[PDB]
């Protein structure tokens, strides 16, 4: 929450379906931009196996950004890692 | 060609993907990438030229592409779209980049960042599109 020294949300996405991963990425980016935040990346990583990888960072997040991200339900078959602060 | 030029294409695939999703100013996108990604071995001039090249020419570059897409329906992957826009940009606007190089680099870029058989679709579009843009095929 809020009072964290580095105001940055780092997100890593994994999926076998690129249509699912691009959609999830689009939704996170939209959530950031809706709520007064900014986005760094997203960038695609070199694919390894059947797995697509996406990295996206949210900078300058508001409380609404954080709450909306945590209320966001991504599509089945898309895996996430989220680090805050 | 230099490995730095290939690296520029690789970095541009990633940055153009950034821009496609974020729609941030391409100048900001260039800067952010140069500040946050390892770019020590990259033709940084060509990276810039690819970015602005594509970002200010999306309508023109999609139009050269469209006649070979109109039927195979899964929207078109964001990575594939960026790879194809880069290739078409090089074919239309970059005489310093040879015919087979633009297509071959596109095919490898699709191998790396693309889906399963992305390289084969990218290939399908290009050698339909490329002769129309370069009748000399040089």
Swiss-Prot record, chain A:
CC terms in the record's Gene Ontology section: cytoplasm; cytosol; cytosolic small ribosomal subunit; small ribosomal subunit; transcription elongation factor complex
GO biological processes: cytoplasmic translation; regulation of DNA-templated transcription elongation; ribosome biogenesis; transcription antitermination
A GO molecular function held by the record: tRNA binding
UniProt KW Ribosomal protein keyword: yes
InterPro entries (alphabetical): Ribosomal_uS10, Ribosomal_uS10_CS, Ribosomal_uS10_dom, Ribosomal_uS10_dom_sf
Domain of life according to the entry: Bacteria
Gene3D superfamilies: Ribosomal protein S10 domain
Transmembrane regions: none
Alphabetized Pfam families for the sequence: Ribosomal_S10
Keywords: Ribonucleoprotein, Ribosomal protein, Ribosome biogenesis, RNA-binding, Transcription, Transcription antitermination, Transcription regulation
Keyword Membrane applies: no
Family: Belongs to the universal ribosomal protein uS10 family.
Subunit structure: Part of the 30S ribosomal subunit. Can also form a heterodimer with the transcription antitermination protein NusB. Binding of S10 to NusB is mutually exclusive with its incorporation into the ribosome. The rRNA transcription and antitermination complex (rrnTAC) consists of RNAP, NusA, NusB, NusE (this protein), NusG, SubB, ribosomal protein S4, DNA and precursor rRNA; S4 is more flexible than other subunits.
Biological role stated in the UniProt entry: Involved in the binding of tRNA to the ribosomes. Part of the processive rRNA transcription and antitermination complex (rrnTAC). The complex forms an RNA-chaperone ring around the RNA exit tunnel of RNA polymerase (RNAP). It supports rapid transcription and antitermination of rRNA operons, cotranscriptional rRNA folding, and annealing of distal rRNA regions to allow correct ribosome biogenesis. In complex with NusB is involved in the regulation of ribosomal RNA (rRNA) biosynthesis by transcriptional antitermination.
Name of this protein: Small ribosomal subunit protein uS10
Organism: Escherichia coli (strain K12)
Upper classification of the organism: Bacteria, Pseudomonadati, Pseudomonadota, Gammaproteobacteria, Enterobacterales
UniProtKB/Swiss-Prot annotation, chain B:
GO cellular component, one term: transcription elongation factor complex
Keyword line: Ribosome biogenesis, RNA-binding, Transcription, Transcription antitermination, Transcription regulation
InterPro entries: NusB-like_sf, NusB_fam, NusB_RsmB_TIM44
GO molecular function, one term: RNA binding
GO biological-process terms attached to the record: DNA-templated transcription termination; regulation of DNA-templated transcription elongation; ribosome biogenesis; transcription antitermination
Pfam families: NusB (PF01029)
Organism domain of life: Bacteria
Reported consequences of knocking out the gene: Inactivation of the gene causes cold-sensitive cell growth.
Oligomeric and partner information: Monomer in solution. Forms a heterodimer with the ribosomal protein S10. The rRNA transcription and antitermination complex (rrnTAC) consists of RNAP, NusA, NusB, NusE (rpsJ), NusG, SubB, ribosomal protein S4, DNA and precursor rRNA; S4 is more flexible than other subunits.
Family classification: Belongs to the NusB family.
Name of protein: Transcription antitermination protein NusB
Higher taxonomy: Bacteria, Pseudomonadati, Pseudomonadota, Gammaproteobacteria, Enterobacterales
């Amino acid at each position: 929450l809020g009072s964290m020294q580095n105001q940055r949300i780092r997100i890593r996405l994994k999926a076998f379906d690129h249509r699912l991963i691009d959609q999830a990425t689009a939704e996170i980016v939209e959530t950031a931009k809706r709520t007064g935040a900014q986005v760094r990346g997203p960038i695609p990583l070199p694919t390894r196996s059947r797995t697509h990888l996406r990295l996206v960072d949210i900078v300058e997040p508001t409380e609404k950004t954080v709450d909306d991200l945590m209320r966001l339900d991504l599509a089945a078959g898309v895996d996430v890692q989220i680090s805050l602060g | 060609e230099p490995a730095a030029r290939r690296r520029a294409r690789e970095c541009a695939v990633q940055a153009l993907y950034s821009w496609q999703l974020s729609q941030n100013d391409i100048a900001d996108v260039e800067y952010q990438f140069l500040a946050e990604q390892d770019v020590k071995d990259v033709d940084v001039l060509y990276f810039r030229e690819l970015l602005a090249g594509v970002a200010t020419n999306t309508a023109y570059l999609d139009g050269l592409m469209k006649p070979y897409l109109s039927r195979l329906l899964e929207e078109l992957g964001q990575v594939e779209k960026a790879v194809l826009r880069i290739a078409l940009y090089e074919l239309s606007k970059r005489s310093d980049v040879p015919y087979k190089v633009a297509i071959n680099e596109a095919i490898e870029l699709a191998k790396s960042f693309g889906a399963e058989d992305s390289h084969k679709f990218v290939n399908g579009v290009l050698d339909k599109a490329a002769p129309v843009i370069r009748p000399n095929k040089k």
